[PDB]
Amino acid sequence: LTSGEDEVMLFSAEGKVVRFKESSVRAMGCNTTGVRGIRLGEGDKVVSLIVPRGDGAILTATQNGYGKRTAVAEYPTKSRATKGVISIKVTERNGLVVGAVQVDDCDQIMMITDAGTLVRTRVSEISIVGRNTQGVILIRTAEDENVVGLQRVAE
Amino acid sequence: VVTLSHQGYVKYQPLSEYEAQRRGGKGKSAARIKEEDFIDRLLVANTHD
Numbered sequence: 714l715t716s717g718e719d720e721v722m723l724f725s726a727e728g729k730v731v732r733f734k735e736s737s738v739r740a741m742g743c744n745t746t747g748v749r750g751i752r753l754g755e756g757d758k759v760v761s762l763i764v765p766r767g768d769g770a771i772l773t774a775t776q777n778g779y780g781k782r783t784a785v786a787e788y789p790t791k792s793r794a795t796k797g798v799i800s801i802k803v804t805e806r807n808g809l810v811v812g813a814v815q816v817d818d819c820d821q822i823m824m825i826t827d828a829g830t831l832v833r834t835r836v837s838e839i840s841i842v843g844r845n846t847q848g849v850i851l852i853r854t855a856e857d858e859n860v861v862g863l864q865r866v867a868e
Numbered sequence: 869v870v871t872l873s874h875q876g877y878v879k880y881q882p883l884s885e886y887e888a889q890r891r892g893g894k895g896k897s898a899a900r901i902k903e904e905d906f907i908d909r910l911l912v913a914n915t916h917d
Binding site for chain 1: 869871883886887888889890891892893894895896897898899900901906907908909910911912
């Protein structure tokens with residue numbers, strides 16, 4: 714749900730962030746195709762969407778349960794249908810970016826794999842790092858497993 | 869909390885059944901997975917929504 718004036722952030726599994734004002738997009742009818750809003754590359758899919766609100770809340774994840782917390786304000790904003798910057802290091806211990814959430818402290822998150830294995834932990838043990846950093850161990854993923862879900866649990 | 873399968877099977881469970889821990893644990897299986905299926909969705913919401 715989007716109010717009259719806010720911001721839209723798009724994310725990709727290859728570490729792409731695109732921020733632009735929602736004013737540049739006009740309302741349309743029901744059975745309308747739409748328009749392109751991000752200069753998407755090749756071999757990538759938009760796997761997450763966040764509407765920023767408040768401040769000081771950002772989290773990511775990978776196929777092996779590696780993520781980090783970064784400041785919201787350090788993400789550059791350009792016009793729509795434009796290339797973004799690298800959000801997190803791909804490396805080889807992480808895999809592919811699955812989803813992103815806007816969670817501050819005093820909250821908890823849940824991660825579920827393709828074969829169940831539900832888990833619930835807090836965000837106190839994850840610190841604030843720079844954007845160009847690799848992930849750290851969050852959940853001990855098992856063999857033949859990849860993280861599929863990521864949800865935020867409030868206080 | 870609501871879980872969905874690839875073939876499509878819905879269910880919700882009380883939130884109090886789970887407890888927080890330290891990062892790096894294994895974690896119990898939330899739902900008895902099928903022989904050939906996998907979970908592709910997850911959501912947390914109030915009962916009256």
